[PDB]
Design an enzyme around this catalytic site. Structure first.
Site, PDB file in Angstrom:
ATOM      1  N   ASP A 107      14.411  35.490 -13.775  1.00  0.00           N
ATOM      2  CA  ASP A 107      13.005  35.202 -13.524  1.00  0.00           C
ATOM      3  C   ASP A 107      12.058  36.007 -14.384  1.00  0.00           C
ATOM      4  O   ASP A 107      11.711  37.168 -14.077  1.00  0.00           O
ATOM      5  CB  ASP A 107      12.737  35.512 -12.056  1.00  0.00           C
ATOM      6  CG  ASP A 107      11.410  34.985 -11.603  1.00  0.00           C
ATOM      7  OD1 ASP A 107      10.638  34.534 -12.499  1.00  0.00           O
ATOM      8  OD2 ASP A 107      11.161  35.018 -10.386  1.00  0.00           O
ATOM      9  N   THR A 108      11.578  35.383 -15.472  1.00  0.00           N
ATOM     10  CA  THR A 108      10.730  36.113 -16.394  1.00  0.00           C
ATOM     11  C   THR A 108       9.342  36.352 -15.798  1.00  0.00           C
ATOM     12  O   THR A 108       8.569  37.195 -16.313  1.00  0.00           O
ATOM     13  CB  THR A 108      10.583  35.355 -17.720  1.00  0.00           C
ATOM     14  OG1 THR A 108      10.059  34.043 -17.480  1.00  0.00           O
ATOM     15  CG2 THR A 108      11.943  35.236 -18.424  1.00  0.00           C
ATOM     16  N   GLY A 109       9.036  35.603 -14.735  1.00  0.00           N
ATOM     17  CA  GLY A 109       7.759  35.848 -14.060  1.00  0.00           C
ATOM     18  C   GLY A 109       7.783  36.939 -13.012  1.00  0.00           C
ATOM     19  O   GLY A 109       6.716  37.195 -12.377  1.00  0.00           O
TER      20      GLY A 109
HETATM   21  C1  LIG Z   1       2.253  40.054  -8.631  1.00  0.00           C
HETATM   22  N1  LIG Z   1       3.586  40.646  -8.418  1.00  0.00           N
HETATM   23  C2  LIG Z   1       4.685  39.694  -8.647  1.00  0.00           C
HETATM   24  C3  LIG Z   1       5.090  39.735 -10.131  1.00  0.00           C
HETATM   25  O1  LIG Z   1       5.996  40.812 -10.309  1.00  0.00           O
HETATM   26  C4  LIG Z   1       6.568  41.167  -9.031  1.00  0.00           C
HETATM   27  O2  LIG Z   1       7.958  40.846  -9.069  1.00  0.00           O
HETATM   28  C5  LIG Z   1       8.300  40.042  -7.941  1.00  0.00           C
HETATM   29  C6  LIG Z   1       7.026  39.197  -7.701  1.00  0.00           C
HETATM   30  O3  LIG Z   1       7.022  38.166  -8.699  1.00  0.00           O
HETATM   31  C7  LIG Z   1       6.834  36.882  -8.293  1.00  0.00           C
HETATM   32  O4  LIG Z   1       6.738  36.499  -7.125  1.00  0.00           O
HETATM   33  N2  LIG Z   1       6.771  36.020  -9.307  1.00  0.00           N
HETATM   34  C8  LIG Z   1       6.550  34.582  -9.289  1.00  0.00           C
HETATM   35  C9  LIG Z   1       5.363  34.303 -10.224  1.00  0.00           C
HETATM   36  C10 LIG Z   1       4.135  35.075  -9.709  1.00  0.00           C
HETATM   37  C11 LIG Z   1       3.616  36.147 -10.418  1.00  0.00           C
HETATM   38  C12 LIG Z   1       2.532  36.890  -9.934  1.00  0.00           C
HETATM   39  C13 LIG Z   1       1.931  36.524  -8.736  1.00  0.00           C
HETATM   40  C14 LIG Z   1       2.456  35.455  -8.005  1.00  0.00           C
HETATM   41  C15 LIG Z   1       3.550  34.727  -8.495  1.00  0.00           C
HETATM   42  C16 LIG Z   1       7.811  33.828  -9.702  1.00  0.00           C
HETATM   43  O5  LIG Z   1       8.081  34.035 -11.099  1.00  0.00           O
HETATM   44  C17 LIG Z   1       7.734  32.325  -9.398  1.00  0.00           C
HETATM   45  N3  LIG Z   1       7.772  32.110  -7.961  1.00  0.00           N
HETATM   46  C18 LIG Z   1       9.032  31.605  -7.448  1.00  0.00           C
HETATM   47  C19 LIG Z   1      10.121  32.671  -7.252  1.00  0.00           C
HETATM   48  C20 LIG Z   1       9.698  33.745  -6.238  1.00  0.00           C
HETATM   49  C21 LIG Z   1      11.427  32.020  -6.762  1.00  0.00           C
HETATM   50  S1  LIG Z   1       6.424  31.379  -7.344  1.00  0.00           S
HETATM   51  O6  LIG Z   1       5.249  31.863  -8.129  1.00  0.00           O
HETATM   52  O7  LIG Z   1       6.373  31.782  -5.906  1.00  0.00           O
HETATM   53  C22 LIG Z   1       6.548  29.640  -7.492  1.00  0.00           C
HETATM   54  C23 LIG Z   1       7.106  28.857  -6.479  1.00  0.00           C
HETATM   55  C24 LIG Z   1       7.198  27.472  -6.610  1.00  0.00           C
HETATM   56  C25 LIG Z   1       6.738  26.827  -7.753  1.00  0.00           C
HETATM   57  O8  LIG Z   1       6.795  25.485  -7.953  1.00  0.00           O
HETATM   58  C26 LIG Z   1       7.287  24.689  -6.888  1.00  0.00           C
HETATM   59  C27 LIG Z   1       6.178  27.606  -8.768  1.00  0.00           C
HETATM   60  C28 LIG Z   1       6.084  28.989  -8.642  1.00  0.00           C
HETATM   61  C29 LIG Z   1       5.960  40.261  -7.981  1.00  0.00           C
END
Ligand SMILES: CN[C@H]1CO[C@@H]2OC[C@H](OC(=O)N[C@@H](Cc3ccccc3)[C@H](O)CN(CC(C)C)S(=O)(=O)c3ccc(OC)cc3)[C@@H]21
Ligand SMILES: [Cl-]
Ligand SMILES: [Cl-]
Ligand SMILES: [Cl-]
Ligand code: NA
Ligand code: NA
Lengths: 99, 99
Positions: free
Chosen positions: B25-27
């Site tokens: 998960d690059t996000g």
């Molecule tokens: C802010 N802190 C977050 C970033 O870094 C920390 O690490 C963990 C957490 O990161 C995230 O929750 N990241 C989100 C993407 C993300 C990034 C930032 C805010 C919210 C979400 C992630 O990449 C994508 N998520 C899914 C995973 C949890 C399975 S999601 O944003 O909830 C998502 C769900 C369904 C989607 O389509 C159906 C499209 C996107 C923390």
């Protein structure tokens, strides 16, 4: 390009005639953009992540330019804390993870 | 490997001698795993995602195998809906995004 992951992989996008910053997010099935207007029809959807679910508007057939590469697909619009480019559009620009 | 994104980028991980599936998960800044037992002490952390914040247990210096690569680093444990490998360990296995 090759993007290392020491920092968040943020790029410039253009959507709805607007320039925004978004995260290239392989853990997102779908692309989710902060509240904005888009043309055409939309339908409501719930999407869930860490924390739980948000309600979004689902717009189909929207063109986005991602780091200079044009793609078309569904874009979800709603109260996400960050703009996310998910796999539905990453595939279209040929993005891969490599290690 | 080179991993395309037409499907979720799921890989096998091994932590505390157990095999699990997790999303590359690059996000995600951080690695977050579903409730399990880990050795040592933990520290508190709040992380925010699409649908708000959750409280997690932060374990540092944990050994974890990811798609066959050795990593040793911080793992957050809590009510995530899926196991996620974030950039803190993606950098340890040498992952990059490419297009
Ligand atoms: C802010 N802190 C977050 C970033 O870094 C920390 O690490 C963990 C957490 O990161 C995230 O929750 N990241 C989100 C993407 C993300 C990034 C930032 C805010 C919210 C979400 C992630 O990449 C994508 N998520 C899914 C995973 C949890 C399975 S999601 O944003 O909830 C998502 C769900 C369904 C989607 O389509 C159906 C499209 C996107 C923390
Ligand atoms: Cl707008
Ligand atoms: Cl799509
Ligand atoms: Cl392809
Ligand atoms: Na449309
Ligand atoms: Na520890």
């Amino acid at each position: 390009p090759q993007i290392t992951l020491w920092k968040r992989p943020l790029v410039t996008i253009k959507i709805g005639g607007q320039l925004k910053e978004a995260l290239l997010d392989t853990g997102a099935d779908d692309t989710v953009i902060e509240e904005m207007s888009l043309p055409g029809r939309w339908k409501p959807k719930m999407i869930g992540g860490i924390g739980g679910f948000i309600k979004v508007r689902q717009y189909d057939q929207i063109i986005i330019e991602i780091a200079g590469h044009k793609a078309i697909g569904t874009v979800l619009v709603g109260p996400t804390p960050v703009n996310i480019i998910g796999r539905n559009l990453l595939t279209q620009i040929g993005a891969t993870l490599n290690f």
